[PDB]
Design an enzyme around this catalytic site. Structure first.
Site, short mmCIF file in Angstrom:
data_model
loop_
_atom_site.label_atom_id
_atom_site.label_comp_id
_atom_site.label_asym_id
_atom_site.label_seq_id
_atom_site.Cartn_x
_atom_site.Cartn_y
_atom_site.Cartn_z
N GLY H 29 0.80 -1.23 0.00
CA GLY H 29 0.00 0.00 0.00
C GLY H 29 0.83 1.27 0.00
O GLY H 29 2.05 1.23 0.10
N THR H 30 0.14 2.41 -0.10
CA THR H 30 0.81 3.72 -0.11
C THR H 30 1.32 4.08 1.28
O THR H 30 0.89 3.49 2.27
CB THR H 30 -0.13 4.86 -0.60
OG1 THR H 30 -1.21 5.03 0.33
CG2 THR H 30 -0.70 4.55 -1.98
N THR H 31 2.23 5.05 1.34
CA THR H 31 2.84 5.44 2.61
C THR H 31 1.91 6.33 3.43
O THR H 31 1.37 7.31 2.92
CB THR H 31 4.18 6.18 2.40
OG1 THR H 31 5.00 5.44 1.47
CG2 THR H 31 4.93 6.33 3.72
#
Ligand code: CL
Ligand code: MG
Lengths: 250, 241, 228, 111, 240, 235, 231, 243, 244
Positions: H29-31
């Site tokens: 997933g994204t940060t």
């Protein structure tokens, strides 16, 4: 969630074997030896207190348990399974008998109730069988003294004397040579201690041996006086000192 | 080989999922120790905060179950907190129903029964934790009762849990072989804590700062955990003799 | 048409324990059904329970809690406490909103000490050194309020308790016959003193009513089979 | 004791012509001897060229009209935007009303 | 509750549990139904592997569902009892609510519906039973004979057989049964039924059961001797 | 094993795709919609000559204005028919009117995907639902076990379907009479049937606005079969 | 592979294959386009027929006077989800006298689809949805995936060959967003967008399905000769 | 083998492989990050701009629970929404019975027990999210991070998603360089920088920055989104640091 | 999920057999032999206990023969614990019937009830079947003396003489050889013991390895008496019939 295991986990194999029951019996075979001997005026049940650690207080672990004032139980196999069975056995003695008839169940009928619970764990959904064999000793007015064995399948058999667990084969042979129908309770205790010594490796004394009897009524253990018909429990657990006294006359 | 996936018997009469739950117990790489005094029960546990981004005050494996009962856990924190919440609920319910505080040994038995159920019922997995309950019971006095994933429990004079439990256990065994008594003959809990920390140092062969340890103390009518500064005062006293 | 008996029941605390007492009359309306019933019951060996109100409810509730107390004692490996019986009784009674007409004096000893409570059908409880219940509670309480003091001995408490019961026996129509007593002292077995006093013995009848044999007219005789 | 019903007064009148229909009602809303509102609409356009009024207990009246309007909406969803004919609406309203046979809408309905 | 889908489709569009239920029917003792002009006869095979049997009390193969309808079957005996009980309850329920006994077609449709239900309900297996349901509609003299099978399909038959070696007796019936002229009497119908079973049975002794159903709730089971007379007459004509 | 509601890597439900294979094994059913009515015809396919063929019921009335033909595991259709009849009658009770053919079809198709671990599997039968209502006139729908329904001018289902559909492709036009449709169903049934077509192994039916749904007598169908034979011999 | 037997099983790389297979059903589905300006929002859908005798499967469903969607994939699943939206739109109006916000409608669809991806016995939905609406914050376009992922967009396309339409809308972004107060031109842009996804077949009168909602425009669907104007 | 095919099964190691596979979805997933400041907390997340057609500032990721708690997560977004929905129910029932808004540690355990419950049975799947959350209660600011296993701890700074290693290193510098603490307005600026720095692991596509905060002085202990001028100021500060 | 571990106890094989029923029958074939013989003036139940011990308390032991009511008894072959579950249910059914109709339950009605319970476990519930075969010996005023057997499939049949458990093939052949319709109880007693003596896997047939019962109208006048034989009484009848 929800218990989605609504199907039997014990089933018949092509050869007709119920695998999980056979394996439960194998767990019982690995268990520490326990025995029972019936005398004319009593019954004795005994086992070794195999302490898992010397730092553990083995008096806090009761392998021999009172089920009713006149009935006691010992086991071989899985300890935790035994403990919960004792809880259920105590309760069912009240719910399915004492709350109905105003008296404690006879040995054979309590054994029957425990057997039914163990049978159901062999057929009901999403459970395994209990990994214990029980030896239940007791007295009641109309049947006298009795000793029963209960297995993981739910099968039970009455015995004059028997042994279960680790060294049961050798112990049963030892009991066959010594048992007769004229034994007094003290003779049965003596034979129990002799038999149990063979299967015990290390220390053999009142602190490493658990032993109880079903014998005479104990008015001293009743806790009250005034009612003539109430004469006290027949189940009595022998003390560490009482065992050692009989180990000198061994 | 699905007898290894759920809690049913293997051909040897074994429960592999229970055995593997015992192995999860050591996943935190933390050792704990419990001992009894005259008037108290002390439990100590290693504290490791490997990340600098962590708030160290929130990293704990010791739980205040009730006013009188404390519990240290050996195993992963999610299962530890699961057991902690349940033990708290059980202790509170007990007091409501029966009108007196739940004894340490009775709570241990209850949690042991719950564990036993997970070893017999297939849909529930065992918790990968060992639970050490401590208190000063109003009837039995100082008490240590330990529960494991098999549903086994027993009282202890003293006990140890973790990867290096054997070293601590033997060390404790040797001391009680000398003293020939079932407890630490000491008046104050402070000195019983000092005994506990000293013998863990001896057994593990490691030194401790104030942030390397976690300490719980049970006295009559209360269990409490020591702050870092309380532990520091303990460590100073140990070093000064 | 259920039994609700008249009674005098009392409880008195003393030095090293507690004593409870009761009369032995069970009524059906104005009719005396049992002239020597036992109103003192057991909950556990050293916890005893005197009951008044709906007779069936007192017996039933005392036996149910006594049963659960025994299982609790076995489960916890501990002797049962009076506060456990008290808490289990009141929560049961409260759940039924007074429809279980059990009014009790609970008394006993345990590791914590000696205790004396009263429980009311709706689920309220009270603590006291001296208590009374039953249709003769006012007669009994009058005696307790007149003669009770702090630091009673065993023999004094038995005397006070039985005197309170006697006040009910003579002055209350609901109470009569004999005086039962149960003494629960700390460190000792509880002693149940069935028919501790018997001041109401039936006098010799003026005449025997034994009939000459054959007096009753009979139509048919027949042997009944009880065997298999 | 709690009385779940009330009387909000009001009078309504429906007359069917040869190629038209009128549904009229007064706009006064009352309880006992007090006026709640001098203008509280009582006759409603329910769509599909149907007008409705449920006179009597106004809470039940508002509930019924609301549920009927909703029924018209779902009739369109379920049956390909078919126009609800006045006879079909009438039968539908019977079922709405009889659904509460043992705790009735205390109203006299006219469409 | 146990909810497992036991009856499911396979890649080739088959429901194997339903098809395996038919294999249980194939194993069952042979049953045969033949309708005459004014009667229906149900014949049933009794395997003589079991002697020392008490024939008074042993469950008979033909069962009355009502006073005017009967049911025979091939397949699992225990399964058949559940269908028979349900059918009997429904027959009384129909009399209670409609104030008229069931038609043979209605009763068949009900039993067939129960069988179908057990092929797409969770946690149950199909019935290992095919049935022959025969009788006369109330106040009607037209003979009725229907067949059901594990899948739940049902149909009417001039004559039909089910169970083991039913392929052989159907072969016999197909060449011996004339639709333009069905067995005009009870005798002719029973004879043709016994003949059809003799193609498969073995000994014509206690191996053949015969039940005759006539209009207006007239149902009777033939005895050993009565059947034995048919067996005797058939082979004496055959010796030619 | 594997879930009953499992998707294949192609994005299809295994059980639905397999039930479609069972329908391919079923006896042929054909429907043709015209402006004078919709015709429904079926292959009876009796397994034996002793089976009384008029007890084979593969064409069924749902309401006066709606008829239905089936192909596949025909025992599965019974609960579908029961639902359809109940839905039709219930709507009339609630609304004092006939239910739309599409609405009826949609109600039947709502049952289709109600399976899992509700019923344990999809239906193994396809339905041709034919009818008339005032809004959309004469209509023919094909209800599948996928829960999808297509409206058709003409449609064939069962074992001879792709051969029959190709034939329907060529023969159907928007000016067909009811009589022309009847013969066309008979012609195509005769083409794809194993056994020789007659009034005992095939069945006709129709739905018209005036007379509603009607299953044809064997005598009526026998005449249409004779009319077919003569017009095919006519060139 | 070994991890695609049910929705309750992660793969070793953390993938949910049953959800991915459900996503695959959308790719097999017929193309549908969504786009909006600041006054109006438009759906354009290429309907698919079984054969030349069959009808063209309807793609667009009305949920309320101010909201509706188009579908690609399993049509019965779209019926279940659109029915749920109808109920939620309806609950908002009846209880709160409030038209359901398009963004909130997306949140509800996400959560409903999510429950089918984390539990045993169930299956993911096998359909993608493009929801358009006009509420108190103007025109809106949402894209729903049965993974649960709902995204608010200016324009998009789902179904087979949807990439061609999506690239076109990505080029035309600055033009079609400015088509305010002109419904016909916004639809033209949508019809031109969906044309970038056609091969072999072209837009006919029973092939094309269009829907529009806007400032003073209730959600209305155009089919048949009503879309001949745009062919 | 086969131990990894079913949730709640212990491997011979004593591991739950299904939980470890859920972590892989989180790592994909994204940060997202969290920074604990002097009197509150700051949350920030990387939002990948997959296409120009995404409406800017509309697809909001950070979620509020009650009025004082903020939640952000990386991994399967729907799983995170499901967890927040539960959290909102927990917070509502706590406030209903006890009047006071749920304390952050109390709330942390509610999420923790719920996530842990999804590792007890094979009939459910573990959560495919790591959740960073927190806010201000009566005892001050609290920041937590919660894993698929149900494991959570208190944090000074927290990071998860694809660029977590980069982010963590940045957070560790702030902890070392500010033992006295960080102000809420400083934390917002630093959060913007860290997301921009962590975007190197996701450098293919451009992104949108989203920030929120709860602060006793700046927001009255209520959760609020960083908008307009304050957001642009943080973006400028971030862009200046990467160049 | 859970499906993975489901054995599916209620499915047909490709041959149309119920796996678990077949395997349960295989289990029963290793159980001690039980024999029932019906005569004109009563019924005999004889059964072999499985390899016993000298320390087993025989006079209080019951594994084979059970009383359902005063008129009906059963002989068990298979899992004793499974049998007791069914036996208690049967005892309750008998009492339910007696309460409802004020008449003793007819033998077949009781047998059908128990057999239907067994059937249910083979069709629904996903549980293992009961690994038990019963021989029912009973009397009612409709059919008189009756013998039935039921097995795990739930199928039941009536018999003049029947065996269950081990060596039924050999036992049934021996019974079929020597049984006659006009036989009496005392003759049936001898046949049963002679059959067990020949079919037993033990070296010799002794009293401690047997359970024995008779249902006789040898009850004074118009009534029936059940007699569960005591260990000494089994020893006497073994000497009387000349086996020991
Ligand atoms: Cl417990
Ligand atoms: Mg388990």
């Amino acid at each position: 969630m929800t218990d989605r295991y609504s199907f039997s986990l014990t089933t018949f194999s092509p050869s007709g074997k119920l695998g999980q029951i056979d394996y439960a019996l194998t767990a019982v075979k690995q268990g520490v030896t326990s025995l029972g001997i019936k005398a004319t005026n009593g019954v004795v049940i005994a086992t070794e207190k195999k302490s898992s650690s010397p730092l553990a207080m083995s008096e806090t672990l009761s392998k021999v348990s009172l089920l009713t004032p006149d009935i006691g139980a010992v086991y071989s196999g899985m300890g935790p399974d035994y403990r919960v069975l004792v809880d259920k056995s105590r309760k069912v003695a009240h719910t399915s008998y004492k709350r109905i008839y105003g008296e404690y169940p006879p040995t054979k009928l309590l054994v029957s109730e425990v057997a039914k619970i163990m049978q159901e764990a062999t057929q009901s959904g999403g459970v395994r069988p209990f990994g214990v064999s029980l030896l239940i000793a007791g007295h009641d007015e109309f049947n006298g003294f009795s000793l029963y064995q209960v297995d993981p399948s739910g099968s039970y058999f009455p015995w004059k004397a028997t042994a279960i667990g680790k060294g049961s084969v050798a112990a049963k042979t030892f009991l066959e040579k010594r048992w007769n129908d004229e034994l007094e309770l003290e003779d049965a205790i003596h034979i129990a201690l002799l038999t149990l010594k063979e299967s015990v490796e290390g220390e053999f004394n009142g602190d490493t041996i658990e032993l109880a009897i079903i014998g005479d009524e104990n008015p001293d253990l009743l806790g009250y006086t005034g009612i003539p018909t109430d004469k006290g429990p027949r189940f009595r657990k022998l003390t560490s000192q009482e065992i050692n006294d009989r180990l000198e006359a061994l | 080989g699905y007898d290894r996936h759920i809690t049913i018997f293997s051909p040897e009469g074994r429960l592999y999922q229970v055995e593997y739950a015992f192995k999860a117990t050591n996943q935190t790489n933390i050792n704990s120790l419990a001992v009894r005094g005259k008037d108290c029960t002390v439990v100590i546990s290693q504290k490791k905060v490997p990340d600098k981004l962590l708030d160290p005050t929130t990293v704990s494996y010791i739980f205040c179950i009730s006013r009188t009962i404390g519990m240290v856990v050996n195993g992963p924190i999610p299962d530890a907190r699961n057991a902690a919440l349940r033990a708290k609920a059980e202790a509170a319910e007990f007091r409501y129903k029966y009108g007196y505080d739940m004894p340490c040994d009775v709570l241990a038995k209850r949690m042991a029964n719950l564990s036993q159920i997970y070893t017999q019922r297939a849909y529930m997995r065992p918790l990968g934790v060992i639970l050490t309950f401590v208190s000063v019971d109003e009837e039995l006095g100082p008490s240590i009762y330990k529960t494991d994933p098999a549903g086994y429990y027993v009282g202890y004079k003293a006990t140890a849990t973790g990867p290096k439990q054997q070293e601590i256990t033997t060390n404790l065994e040797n001391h009680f072989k000398k003293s020939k008594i079932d407890h630490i003959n000491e008046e104050s809990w402070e000195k019983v804590v000092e005994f506990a920390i000293t013998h863990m140092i001896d057994a593990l062969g490691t030194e401790f700062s104030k942030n390397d340890l976690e300490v719980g103390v049970a006295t009559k009518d209360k269990f409490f955990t020591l702050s870092a500064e309380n532990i520091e005062e303990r460590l100073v006293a140990i070093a000064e003799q | 048409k259920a039994t609700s008996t008249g009674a005098t029941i009392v409880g008195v605390k003393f030095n090293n324990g507690v004593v409870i007492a009761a009369d032995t009359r069970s009524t059906q309306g104005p009719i005396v059904a049992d002239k020597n019933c036992a109103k003192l019951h057991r909950i556990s060996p050293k916890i005893w329970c005197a009951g008044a109100g709906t007779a069936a409810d007192t017996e039933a509730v005392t036996q149910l809690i006594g049963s659960n107390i025994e299982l609790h004692s076995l489960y916890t490996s501990r002797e049962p406490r009076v506060v456990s019986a008290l808490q289990m009784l009141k929560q049961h009674l409260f759940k039924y909103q007074g429809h279980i007409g059990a009014y009790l004096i609970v008394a006993g000893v345990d590791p914590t000490g000696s205790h004396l409570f009263s429980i009311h059908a709706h689920g309220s409880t009270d603590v006291g050194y001296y208590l009374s219940l039953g249709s003769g509670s006012l007669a009994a309480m009058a005696v307790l309020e007149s003669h009770w003091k702090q630091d009673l001995t065993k023999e004094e408490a038995i005397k006070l308790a039985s005197d309170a019961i006697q006040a009910g026996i003579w002055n209350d129509l609901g109470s009569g016959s004999n005086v039962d007593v149960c003494v629960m002292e700390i460190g000792k077995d509880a002693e149940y003193l069935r028919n501790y006093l018997t001041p109401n013995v039936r006098e010799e009848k003026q005449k025997s009513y034994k009939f000459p044999r054959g007096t009753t007219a009979v139509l048919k005789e027949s042997i009944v089979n009880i065997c298999d | 004791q709690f009385n779940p019903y009330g009387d909000n007064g009001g009078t309504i009148l429906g007359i069917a012509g040869e190629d038209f229909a009128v549904l009229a009602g007064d706009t006064r809303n009352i309880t006992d001897y007090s006026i709640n509102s001098r203008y509280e609409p009582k006759v409603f356009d329910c769509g599909d060229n149907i007008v409705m009024s449920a006179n009597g207990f106004a809470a039940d009246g508002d509930a019924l009209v609301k549920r009927f309007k909703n029924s018209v909406k779902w009739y369109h969803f379920d049956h390909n935007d078919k126009k609800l004919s006045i006879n079909s609406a009438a039968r539908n309203i019977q079922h709405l009303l009889y659904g509460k046979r043992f705790f009735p809408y205390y109203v006299h309905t006219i469409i | 509750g146990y909810d497992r889908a036991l009856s499911i489709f396979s890649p080739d569009g088959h429901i194997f549990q339903v098809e395996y239920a038919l294999e249980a029917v194939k194993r069952g003792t042979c049953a045969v139904g033949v309708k005459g002009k004014n009667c229906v006869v149900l014949g049933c095979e009794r395997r003589s592997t079991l002697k020392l049997q008490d024939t008074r009390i042993t469950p008979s193969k033909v069962s009355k569902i009502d006073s005017h309808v009967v049911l025979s079957f091939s397949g699992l005996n225990a399964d058949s009892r559940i269908l028979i009980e349900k059918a009997r309850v429904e027959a009384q329920s129909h009399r209670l609510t409609l104030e008229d006994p069931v038609t043979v077609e209605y009763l068949t449709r009900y039993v067939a519906g129960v069988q179908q239900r057990y092929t797409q309900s969770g946690g149950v297996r199909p019935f290992g039973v095919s049935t022959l349901i025969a009788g006369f509609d109330p106040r009607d003299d037209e003979p009725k004979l229907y067949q059901t099978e594990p899948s739940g399909i049902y149909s009417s038959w001039s004559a039909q057989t089910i169970g083991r070696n039913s392929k052989t007796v159907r072969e016999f019936l197909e060449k011996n049964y004339d639709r333009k002229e069905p067995p005009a009497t009870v005798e002719e119908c029973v004879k043709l039924t016994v003949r059809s079973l003799l193609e498969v049975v073995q000994t014509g002794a206690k191996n053949i059961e015969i039940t005759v159903v006539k209009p207006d709730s007239d149902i009777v089971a033939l005895s050993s001797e009565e059947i034995n007379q048919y067996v005797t007459q058939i082979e004496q004509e055959k010796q030619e | 094993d594997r879930g009953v509601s499992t998707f294949s890597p192609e994005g299809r439900l295994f059980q639905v795709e397999y039930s479609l294979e069972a329908i391919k094994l079923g006896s042929t059913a054909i429907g043709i919609a015209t402006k004078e009515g919709v015709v429904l015809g079926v292959e009876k396919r009796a397994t034996s000559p002793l089976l009384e063929s008029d007890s084979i019921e593969k064409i069924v009335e749902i309401d006066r204005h709606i008829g239905c033909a089936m192909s596949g595991l025909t025992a599965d259709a019974r609960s579908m028919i029961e639902h359809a009849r109940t839905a039709a009658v219930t709507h009339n009770l609630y609304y004092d009117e006939d239910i739309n053919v599409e609405s009826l079809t949609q109600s039947v198709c709502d049952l289709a995907l109600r399976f899992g671990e509700l019923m344990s599997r999809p239906f193994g039968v396809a339905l041709l639902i034919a009818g008339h209502d005032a809004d959309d006139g004469y209509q023919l729908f094909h209800a599948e076990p996928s829960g999808t329904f297509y409206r058709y001018n003409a449609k064939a289902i069962g074992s001879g379907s792709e051969g029959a559909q190709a034939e329907l492709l060529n023969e159907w036009h928007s000016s067909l009479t009811l009589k022309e449709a009847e013969l066309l169903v008979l012609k195509i049934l005769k083409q794809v049937m194993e056994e020789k077509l007659d009034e005992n192994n095939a069945q006709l039916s129709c739905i018209t606005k005036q007379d509603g749904f009607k299953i044809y007598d064997n005598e009526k169908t026998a005449e249409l079969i004779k009319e077919l034979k003569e017009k095919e011999a006519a060139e | 592979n070994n991890y695609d037997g049910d929705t309750v099983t992660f793969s070793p790389t953390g993938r949910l294959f049953q959800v991915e297979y459900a996503l695959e059903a959308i790719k097999q589905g017929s193309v549908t386009v969504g786009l909006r300006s600041n006054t109006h929002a438009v759906l354009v859908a290429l309907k698919r027929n079984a054969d030349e005798l069959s009808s063209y499967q309807k793609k667009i469903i009305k949920c309320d006077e101010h909201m509706g969607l188009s579908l690609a994939g399993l049509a019965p699943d779209a019926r279940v989800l659109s029915n749920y939206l109808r109920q939620q739109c309806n609950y908002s109006s009846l209880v709160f006298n409030r038209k359901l916000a398009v963004e909130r409608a997306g949140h509800l669809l996400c959560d409903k689809a999510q429950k089918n991806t984390q539990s045993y016995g169930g299956r993911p939905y096998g359909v993608g949805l493009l929801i358009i609406g006009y509420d108190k914050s103007g025109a809106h376009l949402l894209e729903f995936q049965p993974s649960g992922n709902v995204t608010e967009l200016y324009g998009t396309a789902i179904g087979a060959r949807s990439q061609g339409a999506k690239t076109y809308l990505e080029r035309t972004l600055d033009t079609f967003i400015k088509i305010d107060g002109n419904p016909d031109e916004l639809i033209k842009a949508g019809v031109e967008a969906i044309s970038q996804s056609l091969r072999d077949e072209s837009l006919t009168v029973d092939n094309l399905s269009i829907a529009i909602v806007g400032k003073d425009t209730p959600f209305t669907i155009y089919d048949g000769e009503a879309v001949a104007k745009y062919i | 083998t086969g131990y990894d095919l079913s949730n709640s099964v212990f491997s011979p190691d004593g591991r739950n492989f299904q939980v470890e596979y859920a972590v892989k979805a989180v790592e994909n997933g994204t940060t997202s990050i969290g920074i604990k400041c002097n009197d509150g907390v700051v949350f920030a997340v990387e939002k990948l701009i997959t296409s120009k057609l995404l409406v800017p500032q509309k697809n909001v990721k950070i979620q509020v629970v009650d009025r004082h708690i903020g939640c952000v997560y990386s991994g399967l977004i729907p799983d995170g929404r499901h967890l927040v929905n539960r959290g909102r129910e927990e917070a509502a029932s706590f406030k209903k019975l006890y009047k006071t808004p749920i304390p952050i540690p109390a709330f942390a355990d509610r999420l923790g027990q719920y996530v842990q419950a999804h590792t007890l049975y094979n009939s459910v799947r573990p959560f495919g999210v790591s959740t960073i959350f927190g806010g201000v209660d009566k005892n001050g600011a609290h920041l937590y991070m919660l894993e698929p296993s149900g494991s959570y701890w208190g944090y000074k700074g927290a990071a998860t998603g694809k660029g977590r290693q980069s982010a963590k290193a940045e957070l560790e510098k702030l902890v070392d360089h500010h033992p006295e603490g960080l102000s809420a307005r400083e934390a917002v600026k630093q959060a913007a920088k860290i997301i921009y720095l962590a975007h190197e692991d996701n450098k293919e596509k451009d992104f949108e920055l989203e920030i929120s905060w709860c602060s006793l002085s700046e927001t009255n202990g209520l959760h609020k989104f960083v908008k307009g001028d304050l957001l642009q100021e943080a973006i400028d500060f971030a862009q200046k640091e990467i160049n | 999920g859970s499906r993975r571990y489901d054995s599916r106890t209620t499915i047909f094989s490709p041959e149309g057999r119920l796996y678990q029923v077949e395997y349960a029958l295989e289990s029963i074939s290793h159980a001690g032999t039980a024999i029932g013989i019906m005569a004109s003036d009563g019924i005999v139940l004889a059964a072999e206990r499985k390899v016993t011990s000298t320390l087993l308390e025989q006079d209080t032991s019951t594994e084979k023969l059970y009383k359902l009511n005063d008129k009906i008894a059963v002989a068990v072959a298979g899992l004793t614990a499974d049998a007791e579950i069914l036996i208690n249910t049967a005892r309750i059914h008998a009492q339910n019937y007696l309460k409802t109709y004020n008449e003793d339950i007819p033998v077949e009605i009781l047998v059908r009830r128990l057999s239907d319970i067994k059937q249910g476990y083979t069709q629904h519930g996903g549980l293992r079947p009961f690994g038990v075969s019963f021989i029912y010996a009973g009397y009612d005023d409709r059919y008189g003396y009756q013998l039935y057997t039921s097995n795990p499939s739930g199928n039941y049949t009536g018999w003049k003489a029947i065996s269950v458990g081990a060596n039924t093939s050999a036992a049934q052949t021996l019974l079929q050889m020597d049984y006659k319709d006009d036989m009496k109880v005392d003759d049936a007693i001898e046949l049963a013991l002679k059959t067990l003596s020949k079919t037993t896997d033990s070296s010799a047939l002794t009293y401690d390895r047997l359970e024995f019962a008779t249902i006789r109208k040898g009850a004074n006048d118009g009534e029936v008496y059940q007699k569960i034989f005591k260990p000494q009484e089994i020893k006497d009848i073994l000497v009387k019939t000349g086996i020991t």
